[PDB]
Design a protein around this nucleic acid. Structure first.
Lengths: 50, 86, 99, 59
RNA sequence: CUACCCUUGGUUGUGUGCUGUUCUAAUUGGUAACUGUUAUCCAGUUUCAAGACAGUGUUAGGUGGGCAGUUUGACUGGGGCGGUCGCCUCCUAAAAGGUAACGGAGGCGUACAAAGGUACCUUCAGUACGGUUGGAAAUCGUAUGUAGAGUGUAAUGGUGUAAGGGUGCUUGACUGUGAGACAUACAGGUCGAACAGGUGAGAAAUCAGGUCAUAGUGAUCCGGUGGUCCAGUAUGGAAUGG
RNA sequence: GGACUGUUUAACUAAAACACAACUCUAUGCCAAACCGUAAGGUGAUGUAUAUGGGGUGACACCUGCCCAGUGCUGGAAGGUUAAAGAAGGAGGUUAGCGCAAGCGAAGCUUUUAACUGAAGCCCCAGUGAACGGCGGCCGUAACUAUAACGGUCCUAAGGUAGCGAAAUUCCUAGUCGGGUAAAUUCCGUCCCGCUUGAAUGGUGUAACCAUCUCUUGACUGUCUCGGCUAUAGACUCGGUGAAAUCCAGGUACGGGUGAAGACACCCGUUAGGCGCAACGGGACGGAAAGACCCCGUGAAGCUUUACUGUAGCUUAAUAUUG
RNA sequence: UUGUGGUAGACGAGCGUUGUAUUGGAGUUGAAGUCAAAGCGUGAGCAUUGGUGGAUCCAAUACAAGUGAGAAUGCCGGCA
RNA sequence: UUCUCGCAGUCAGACAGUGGGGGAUAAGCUUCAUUGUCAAGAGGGGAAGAGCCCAGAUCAUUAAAUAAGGUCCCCAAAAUA
RNA sequence: AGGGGUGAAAUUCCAAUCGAAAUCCGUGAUAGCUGGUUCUCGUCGAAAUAGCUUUAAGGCUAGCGUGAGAUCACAAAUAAG
RNA sequence: UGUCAGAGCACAUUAAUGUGUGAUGGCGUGCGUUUUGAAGUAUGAGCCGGCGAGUUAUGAUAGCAAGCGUUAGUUAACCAGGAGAUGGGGAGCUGUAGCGAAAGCGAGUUUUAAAAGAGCGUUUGUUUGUUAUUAUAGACCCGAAACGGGUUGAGCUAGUC
RNA sequence: CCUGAGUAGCUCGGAAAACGUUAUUUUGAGUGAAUCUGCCCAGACCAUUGGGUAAGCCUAAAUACUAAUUAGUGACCGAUA
RNA sequence: AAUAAAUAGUCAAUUAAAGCAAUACGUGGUGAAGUGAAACAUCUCAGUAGCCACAGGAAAAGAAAACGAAUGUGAUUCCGU
């Protein structure tokens, strides 16, 4: 269908973390959130990776 | 006779999800087990009953399911769980 | 099954890179079964006369178990189990780890 | 007879029978399911009650 | 001046295959003569015509029902034409569930980083009244007003201090799980206590495992990307595999 | 209608079918094009453009019109696309060694794709009509009308030329009208709103001819009103021999009703001494072919095609032959 | 006490039949064979005798089966 | 009528009643739900009758009493007001 | 002399019938489709639904049957509240 | 179109309510097949008689029973012999540990940070004979036109010399 | 000094090897080596290590078969076999 | 002989089969379809069937650039695993 998926990766451990749905038709603005990370066992800021 | 005509768009029955009070009065039900399943509110939670976030009901504590009628003309229904302490 | 997709075909596959090889052959020795039999200085020369292994034996040894015994176990084996080590060493036997 | 090797590439022999398997929904994509049912998928599963006769005859 | 970047044209300038040539010795010839032989076969000696061509062989192409093997779904008040094939809501459906139809309706292949979560604040729509443009109907103030307002939307139910409108922080729109359960031919689908870590909001108790829910979706093969405490055909690697 | 002497699907149909000279278009200059087959070899052919092969119509008279939009064909060369193949390279890996590590990396070899050259062919442009093929609609328009000579407009590449036309072609339509005919859904002539006539899958006519089709008439009659007679060979008898198909068993009525839904057997009522002969046949859902009409089969077989995949074959190119 | 309708279908118990292996028995004073007859049995089955016949047969048990016929538009042959 | 196993048969059902849909509230019509029968199980009544009622049958017997149903004759038994 | 020929062409013909002769073998081909498939007795004893299926007269599971072993009173219905 | 009764008729036994026959009375739509359902005007069967369709080899599962057993048991093939049973011959097999993809660990293992939770396990037989079902092989039987290749064929017919 | 040269390889297609073309073996085309401190092999492949030394020929014996002869056997058939 | 020589060719002589068949097995080469896959186009029977060729009483492969991963075995072939 309308392929809208964007995969999320870590900034330091570079682990692939989550699949989210990003609204570029409204904003091309990049998003950097913080979520779980296993290799360091804590909440770390992750980004999107194309 | 037998000929093809325009469309009379479907009345095909969507898969009927089983709904209703899976548990009845007089039964001992522990924590976790669900009681009533609905998509569209008709019964309310009282105490000791948990609301799974699809308008679904389940038991929060061990006890017996019990009903209460109330509202503007006692048509509204709220469900709860009564305890039996030793 | 009368024209359906087979169950083993709708299931995911199990992958392994040991393909082109086989599992690692080793003869097992557990404390429970050897408790029935009486023998000391258990080696290659011991199991052949007890018919446990063949004359063409080439398989190395596991030692396995944590049960208790009152006999002086005497093994000369390639590897061991730590619980088995505790069990044999408490019994005042002999422990030889001969790879 | 012979043994259906293609089938047995997908099972894992277990003690006293009672074959197990992997939760089966993954070939092409999963950007439609919540992580809860994802980790339900991550668990290995077992065959149902009825399919024991349907699998044993293959063995 | 020092240079760089350009454009078109001219000089040769090194190589790239080429349609253009010369010669005959490869080679061709259903040119012609002679010996076998007196033989419309043939071979040899050759002449002539040519000729590095053609043809042959391999390869790569384009073309090629001439031919070869196959296919040309199902459902159905006969068949074909028509229409339909997945999932969601209402009625049918006999106040439990479930209940057919080539039954009537509607729909869909979603959107949202906020329209969520948190903490706080706040409420009908509408009627009438009086009020600069301002008229059926703009918005202000007041009372009236029990839902006819909104509910991200197709529908259903509920949602009157709310799941709605606004304000501040944030992306729990977590990880590993998971007792217990619902419905269940398989596939499967659905919730969820609770534990442990990490958090966030809130003073905190508490809440946050996405949206008020019911739809927004396809098994499996195959190939790929990132990471990986996995293996490495004697070994060490490596490739590749997991 | 066919021109015609002509040919045929033995054993359903014989001709308006086929052939047919004649004409038409195209291709072919020798070891020819073309054909058989794998190939020698052979035909065409011991042929040589007044010749051959293929295609089309089908005496003859007079004509065959518009369009190359698309495809088919032919040519062309600027331009874009285009395989294989040749190879300026690229990075990775082993580590001799350099290396405290961290790593770097000689040479050899492997991995793998690329700068560039790169045929035919496709797109391109012209021609191509007795090729495949087709040849439109609307609106307005004329001092009686009606109509459309005409013009404009939308699209196409082009909007049917001539001719004929209710006919082997026309649903409407048993069109109108005329005659024919006592009495005309048939006949023909005739007017042309021809759903779509229509020019080489020809058009209009064409004398003879056709076991051709159709209509009328003359004679002619048992075709008919309208049936009868005679003689034969049986069928009838006697004599010689002497089958066949079919068959669960039959001591095998009628009416009504029921019934697997149409009765010789069922139920209810009526009727018939036993056994034959000549017979003609109502039925026994008569006999004779697991129904060919019809459905299904994930049947088969055959047929066609721009359905899929390939091949025979044709054509273009690199290579060894090959200087 | 329940019992005993019964389709496909399932469970259960048996009979006969050909040969082999044994302990036995009979046989021109007529075996197996055949048909006839006023039998036996819960069933597959078992008989008694006569006549024709002229030579091997039968009881009990164990084994193995080309081991049980109304149908197949059945076949073969024959008679209707 | 739960648990494990073997063997199954089995997806072309029909009829009667009750409620609907289509149909035309027409249908020995079609399709769903419910109660019974036949199929899969014979019989007495309905004049016979596949589904209706009474009903559920080991065999034999020259027993009786009933069910539905019936009692003018066939054809079993009835009369009284 | 037959993925052939022949042919004044219609599927003409090919040893009395051919959309590609007759025969050999492959082959005991295949056919979700019919027809049939042989001793007795005892007992229990069905369905004809749902879902899926290039599936619709083929198949698979659940369901409803049976045999054996069970669980065997917190299990199952039959009455009432 | 026979049964149940029944005269009547004629004889006299596997000693048996004797046998044989039956004027009449009561009753009464064949056999299978497919099937919702066939008495059927659905299908097939003239008939007698012969014959005529569940097996083999391997193997799995399950059942019954037996043997064996607490490291058992089982020998294949092969050699020896009455081509016999059998003897020799463990070569392998089931089991005593499984878990995980694996390294590896081990009554623990897998995920995980987790020896948290969860899943598996927390020993439960061997070899035979028989039976039932079943997969490979034409594997109940009979049946399709067909398809492939190889042969016989132009003297019918067609044509040609 | 020698020990088998259009050879092994290499490129494009192939087959077999239990493999769907993959180490290995074979070739259809082109290409094309090395000489003892040599080569190749060790399922791509390098280094180390180890194995054995192609591009020459032949070879019994176990193992296959029974139309024929001889003898015998048979829970083989007994004239629709 | 062409062509002088020599060859081609011709003439004369010696040696072996050529052939058939044990209706089977050995090898080499050519080399199917049908069927299954519930269709079918990869596969599948199968390198089977069939055809061609040379022989034998057997024939073929055969003496390590072998297998392969072990301080390994040491022609080829056959049988169970």
């Amino acid at each position: 269908a309308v392929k809208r998926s964007t995969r999320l990766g870590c900034n330091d451990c570079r682990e692939i973390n989550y699949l989210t749905f990003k609204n570029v038709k409204k904003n091309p603005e990049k998003l950097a959130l913080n979520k779980f990370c296993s290799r360091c066992r804590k909440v770390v800021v992750h980004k999107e990776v194309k | 006779s037998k000929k093809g005509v325009g469309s009379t768009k479907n009345g095909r029955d969507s898969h009927a999800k089983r709904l209703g009070a899976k548990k009845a009065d007089g039964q001992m039900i522990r924590t976790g087990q669900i009681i009533y399943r609905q998509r569209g509110t008709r019964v309310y939670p009282g105490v000791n009953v948990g609301l799974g976030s699809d308008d679904t009901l389940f038991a929060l504590s061990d006890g017996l399911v019990k009903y209460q009628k109330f509202g503007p003309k006692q048509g509204k229904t709220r469900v709860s769980v009564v305890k039996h302490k030793l | 099954e009368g024209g359906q997709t087979p169950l083993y075909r709708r299931l995911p596959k199990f992958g392994n890179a040991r393909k082109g090889f086989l599992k690692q052959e080793w003869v097992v020795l557990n404390l429970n079964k050897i408790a029935k039999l009486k023998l000391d200085k258990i080696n290659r020369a011991s199991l052949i006369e007890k018919q446990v292994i063949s004359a063409k034996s080439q398989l190395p040894i596991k030692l396995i178990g944590h049960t208790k015994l009152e006999k002086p176990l005497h093994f000369e084996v390639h590897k061991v189990s730590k619980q088995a080590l505790k069990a044999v060493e408490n019994a005042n036997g002999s422990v030889k780890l001969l790879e | 007879m012979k043994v259906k090797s293609a089938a047995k590439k997908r099972f894992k022999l277990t003690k006293s029978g009672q074959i197990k398997r992997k939760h089966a929904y993954t070939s092409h994509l999963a950007p439609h399911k919540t992580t809860k049912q994802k980790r339900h998928l991550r668990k290995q599963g077992t065959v149902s009650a009825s399919d024991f006769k349907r699998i044993g005859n293959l063995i």
